[PDB]
Amino acid sequence: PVERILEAELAVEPVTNICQAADKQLFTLVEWAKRIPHFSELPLDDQVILLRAGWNELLIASFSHRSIAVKDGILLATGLHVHRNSAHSAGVGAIFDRVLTELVSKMRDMQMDKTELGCLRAIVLFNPDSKGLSNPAEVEALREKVYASLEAYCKHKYPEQPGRFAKLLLRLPALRSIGLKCLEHLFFFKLIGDTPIDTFLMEMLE
Amino acid sequence: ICQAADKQLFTLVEWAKRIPHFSELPLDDQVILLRAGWNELLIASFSHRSIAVKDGILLHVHRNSAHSAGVGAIFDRVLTELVSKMRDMQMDKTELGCLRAIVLFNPDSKGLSNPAEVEALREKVYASLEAYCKHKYPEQPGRFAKLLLRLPALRSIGLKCLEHLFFFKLIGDTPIDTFLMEMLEAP
Amino acid sequence: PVTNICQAADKQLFTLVEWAKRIPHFSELPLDDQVILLRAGWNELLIASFSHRSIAVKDGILLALHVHRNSAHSAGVGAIFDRVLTELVSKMRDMQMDKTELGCLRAIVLFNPDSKGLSNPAEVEALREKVYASLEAYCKHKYPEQPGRFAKLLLRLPALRSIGLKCLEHLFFFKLIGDTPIDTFLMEMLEAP
Amino acid sequence: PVERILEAELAPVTNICQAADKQLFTLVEWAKRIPHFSELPLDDQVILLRAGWNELLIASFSHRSIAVKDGILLATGLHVHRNSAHSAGVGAIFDRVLTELVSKMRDMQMDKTELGCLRAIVLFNPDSKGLSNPAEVEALREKVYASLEAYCKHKYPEQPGRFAKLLLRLPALRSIGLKCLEHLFFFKLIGDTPIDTFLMEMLEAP
Ligand SMILES: CCOCCOc1cc2c(cc1-n1c(C(F)(F)F)nc3cc(C(=O)O)ccc31)C(C)(C)CCC2(C)C
Ligand SMILES: CCOCCOc1cc2c(cc1-n1c(C(F)(F)F)nc3cc(C(=O)O)ccc31)C(C)(C)CCC2(C)C
Ligand SMILES: CCOCCOc1cc2c(cc1-n1c(C(F)(F)F)nc3cc(C(=O)O)ccc31)C(C)(C)CCC2(C)C
């Protein structure tokens, strides 16, 4: 149900400060997931497993799509444009370049729309490879329903681009490797945790 | 030893040269694509080959060897995310071939002279794969997508196999201890 | 359970900066360089503190709360935890490393002239030299029957550096939370109205 | 000790395994010439070489490269320029070798006796896992650094901080060693041109 995946997308666009910002960011993911058809019908254990397996790729996909508007940076939560400032301070320039060249610029060149992003995120959420699912068949079947619905949407809205569905799915490998590299280099810790630590230390040091 | 990797690399280059339009790319870009792809291309082949084998991988290697060498978790990922999914859907050699060609034609590879050209060759392969799945399995309209959606698992299993030196560690501590002992016992 | 943990991190960070400001000449460095030194060092400085604190305890570490190596091994950071016990804690115990010696080692770590982006690494090196000359003088006068003691102290710094790196890589502190508290945090979020 | 440690110092993917074999053998020949190393149980000798090989190689090529303000000399006398490192994807780790090891060896004019003793200290690593008698390895380490201290005090009595300064390069060696394994520093720098040229040649005849 492609209208309802679009609806989920739209509703969502000290070092305690760092824990708080992480809390908020994670909660936005959970609110979006609860609005995806049939997610809330899965056993709660499996819902937890899916959000733990997906949270990282789901955030990256959102800020990558948000950054289409902008040249040579990404827009995060709390509205902030990052060029190579927080990026360069955190030493995550290489990961930033990967986001711009593999996700942002490809989303821009094909004019990926919010329905398409929504469906890709729902596919990532319904990950039947996630370790310890009670019923991966049930998760695979929800994934199938999302991509069948995505294919139908692309064929109706962009019938002159018969390769578009495949092109969307073929961003998911780049999302998976950028997701892994973001965890390896603590991309999230460093970007949430740059200015609150720096300003806190500077003030105490006077 | 290093010989088996040499052989495996040669076989890979022979396979790539036989993929339509690969040899038309600038030689620099062909080198970049093989360097960017070799790891996922090999994992995809031995994963598909291991359909034949009960609960291990053929290169043969069962979970005990994996867990003893400290790479049990990565071994389980290969069986559950690649081997068993290839088995359950009866992925055929044509489908594996097209998936490997898609991996080879990776337009994200760093330093390509013309990534648009590589994306266009990728497009030609997956259009051809879609046509094949639609004709051979017309009662499975989700099959094309299901094939493409093994490529994220291949990407992460590829990265984890490099990180943990999966293949080196499967050789074990004994051969390396033996190699050092032989060096030590020189005059 | 999780708010308690973010609070104790706040406290621990405050304590670190108060300690650094009391190290001779630290506060004379350009503020940018002071920030760089604390960002480059905080991890090894904390590991050194809890390692020395843990001398009293068998096969766990005291934070400031006891953590036993069972929690480490269950959370899958067992090997890094055992490196803390065998490479730092037990060596600190066997040589009876004292608080002056730990202080000097931490001051050496703080004054790291390798830290990237220092305006004047030569100035940081010169402060490091003053600390280790002062440590050597202390070891020679307080323990003159142990001529190897100064060297033994400095030769724990490689183990601190590798343990520090491995603690970041494998998210040692996050993983010591356990899976159950994070699963409980997500379950609470999922059950909100 | 110190005269004999100085004496030890002074003495197509197959082609990359061959160069690694040679490089590793040079390490083992050097270790066998360190006093009392060959008296250790053979198992412990293997454990010490497995635990040390990486830091022992980095220390040697770092000291060798004192001559050069660019790059590193790789035993044969072959210069590897910053650009080859950055092109082969290990630029960051290469800059860490030049700034934290090479330039600091140059600033203090570390001599071959001092390098020999540092390498002997690294070899006699009592933290190495599974040693039959770590106490025996610790005692050999202590004898090396006592001997190094006596050498520094006699040869450089005007530099009282020299012994400490030598030992304080060992943390940089440990972190650069770990980063060299993570990024396959050795494979990539020995291996970059040999693979690229091999592939280009095979790719050129249909
Ligand atoms: C379900 C797992 O958490 C999902 C979102 O991430 C966090 C969440 C939280 C945290 C950190 C993070 N956190 C963060 C953060 F958002 F930057 F803080 N990055 C993380 C990386 C990993 C990992 O690489 O395995 C794990 C957790 C990370 C802390 C530990 C701050 C406590 C509050 C919670 C639960 C909100
Ligand atoms: C009591 C221990 O004292 C503090 C130890 O350090 C941590 C502590 C914590 C955390 C992270 C870390 N932590 C860690 C960790 F080691 F990976 F856990 N990496 C961090 C990076 C930053 C940053 O780049 O700004 C900030 C904090 C990081 C999280 C965010 C997991 C919350 C809870 C606490 C205490 C465990
Ligand atoms: C220029 C440096 O030369 C010494 C390298 O040591 C080796 C030695 C050997 C090998 C690999 C390596 N080898 C190499 C290498 F040199 F590129 F070859 N890098 C290695 C990394 C690890 C690790 O991270 O755990 C382990 C072994 C590694 C192989 C295992 C392939 C077979 C036997 C030998 C002798 C050749």
For residue A35, the surrounding DSSP H or E stretch is none
Please tell me if the CB atom of residue A200 comes closer than 6 angstroms to any atom of ligand 1: no
In this complex, which chains have at least 3 CB pairs below 8 Å with chain A?
B, C
Tell which residue, C40, C77, B162, has the closest CA to residue A181: B162
Q: Three-class SS of residue A37? A: coil
B162 touches chain A (CB under 8 A): no
Chain C contact for A180, CB < 8 A?
no
Question: Given an 8 Å threshold on Cβ–Cβ distance, is B13 in contact with D203?
Answer: yes
- Could you tell me if the CB of C186 is within 6 A of ligand 1? yes
* CA of C169 vs chain D CAs: smallest distance (Å): 11
The SS3 of residue D197 is helix
Cβ of residue C182 lying under 6 Å from some atom of ligand 1: yes
Q: Is the CB of C2 under 6 A from ligand 2?
A: no
Q: Is D23 in the pocket of ligand 3 (CB under 6 A)?
A: yes
Ligand nearest to the CA of B183: 3
Q: Using CB atoms within 10 Å of the CB of residue A60, give its burial: 0 to 12 exposed, 13 to 18 middle, 19+ buried.
A: buried
* Contact (Cβ atoms closer than 8 angstroms) between residue C107 and residue C23: yes
Q: What are the helix and strand counts (H, E) for chain A?
A: 12, 2
* A185 Cα to the center of ligand 2, angstroms: 14
Contact A63, A24 (CB under 8 A): no
Phi and psi at B57, nearest 5°, equal -125, 140
Contacts of A108 (CB under 8 A, 6+ apart): A68
Q: Residue C61 pairs with which residues in a beta bridge?
A: C67
β-pair partners for B109: none
Task: Identify which of D146, D165, D175 has the shortest CB distance to residue C148.
Answer: D146
Q: How far apart are CA D67 and CA D61, in angstroms?
A: 11
Discontinuities in chain C (C→N > 2.5 Å), after residue: 64
Identify the closest residue of chain B to A123 by CA–CA distance: B149
Identify the chains in contact with D, defined as 3+ C-beta pairs within 8 A.
B, C
Q: How far apart are CA D182 and CA C170, in angstroms?
A: 13
Domain around B172: 1-187
Nearest CA in chain B to A151: B145
* Cβ contact, residue pair A201, C21, below 8 Å: no
Q: B-chain residues within 8 Å CB-CB of A167?
A: 123
Contacts of A90 in chain C (CB under 8 A): none
Q: For residue D27, give the ligand nearest its CA.
A: 3
| CA torsion angle A53 A55 A56 A57 (round to 10) | 80
C150 vs D: CB within 8 A: yes
Half-sphere exposure of C140 (CA within 13 A, CB side): 6
Count interface pairs A-C at CB distance under 8 A.
59
Asked whether B122 and B136 are in contact (CB, 8 A), the reply is: no
Closest to C112 measured CA to CA, from C173, C17, C168, C29? C29
Cβ contact, residue pair A148, B141, below 8 Å: yes
Tokens of A116: 């398409």
Any chain A CB within 8 A of the CB of C186? yes
Give the relative orientation of helices B2-17 and D14-32 as an angle to the nearest 10 degrees.
Answer: 160
| C-beta of residue A102 within 8 angstroms of C-beta of residue A57 | no
Distance of CA A99 to the CA centre of its chain: 11
Q: D175 and C157 in contact by Cβ < 8 A?
A: no
Ligand 3 pocket residue status of D20, Cβ below 6 Å: yes
CA distance B31 to B118: 13
User: E strand or H helix at D180, and its extent?
Assistant: helix D170-182
Interchain proximity D200–B176, CB inside 8 Å: no
Three-state DSSP class for residue D79: strand
Instruction: Please report the atom of ligand 3 found closest to the CA of residue B171.
Output: 30
Helices (H), A35-135: 44-66, 86-89, 93-98, 105-109, 114-125
DSSP assignment of chain C = -HHHHHHHHHHHHHHHHHHHHTSTTGGGS-HHHHHHHHHHHHHHHHHHHHHHHGGGSSSEEE---EEEHHHHHHTT-HHHHHHIIIIIIHHHHHTT--HHHHHHHHHHHHS-TTSTT-S-HHHHHHHHHHHHHHHHHHHHHH-TT-TTHHHHHHTTHHHHHHHHHHHHHTTHHHHHT-HHHHHHHHHHHHT--
CA distance C131 to C106: 10
Contact between D99 and C114 (Cβ < 8 Å): yes
The CB of C184 under 6 Å from ligand 1? The reply is no
Beta bridge partners of D80: D72
**How many angstroms separate the CA of residue A30 from the nearest CA in chain C?**
6
Specify the resolution in Å: 2.2
Mutation pick from B155, B156, B157, B161 vs chain A, by most beta carbons of A within 10 Å, is B155
Q: Sort out which chain B residues have CB atoms less than 8 A from A163's CB and list them.
A: 123, 126-127
Pocket test for ligand 2, best of C36, C44, C50, C173 (most atoms within 8 A of CB): C173
Nearest CA to ligand 1 atom 24: A183
What whole-number distance in Å separates Cα of residue B158 and Cα of residue B153? 8
Domain count for chain B:
1
For residue A2 the two structure tokens come to: 């492609």
Q: Tell me if B10 sits within 8 A of B16, measured CB to CB.
A: no
Residue D196 and residue D13: Cα distance in Å, rounded?
11
| Residue owning the nearest CA to atom 27 of ligand 1 | C174
- Enumerate the residues of chain B whose CB falls inside 8 A of the CB of residue D199: 13, 30-31, 34-35
Nearest CA to ligand 2 atom 7: C173
| Ligand closest in space to the Cα of B167 | 3
Alpha-carbon span C132 to C148, nearest angstrom? 14
Backbone angles phi, psi at B56, to 5 degrees: -150, -165
Of A14, A34, A47, the CB nearest to C10: A14
Q: Which of A127, C79, A66 has the alpha carbon at shortest distance from B156? A: A127
Interfacial C residues in 103-142 facing D (CB < 8 Å): 108, 114, 128-129, 132-133, 136
Which pairing describes strands D72-73 and D79-80: parallel, antiparallel, or unpaired? antiparallel
Amino acid at the residue B183: M
Tokens of C127: 């402060």
Which two three-digit tokens encode residue C36? 């760089």
* Size (chain D), residues: 206
| E strand residue ranges, chain B | 56-57, 61-62
Instruction: Please state the atom number of ligand 2 nearest to the C-alpha of residue A197.
Output: 25
User: Is C13's C-beta closer than 6 angstroms to any atom of ligand 2?
Assistant: no
Helix (H/G/I), strand (E/B), else coil: D128? coil
Q: Which of B9, B163, B176, B181 maximizes ligand 3 atoms within 8 Å of its Cβ, making it the mutation to test the pocket? A: B176
- CB contact under 8 Å between B81 and A162, yes or no, is no
Q: Tell me how far the alpha carbon of residue C143 is from its chain's centroid.
A: 25
- Tokens 């945790």 appear where? A193
D190-200: b or e for each residue (b if 16 or more CB lie within 10 Å)? bbbeebbebbe
What residue owns the CA closest to ligand 3's atom 2?
A: D20
Residue of D99, D149, D161 with shortest CB distance to C132: D161
What letter does residue D37 receive in the DSSP assignment?
G
Q: Output the CA A17–ligand 1 centroid distance in Å.
A: 13
- Cα distance between the two ends of chain A: 56
Q: Which amino acid is at A151?
A: E
Q: Which ligand is located closest to the Cα atom of residue A23?
A: 1
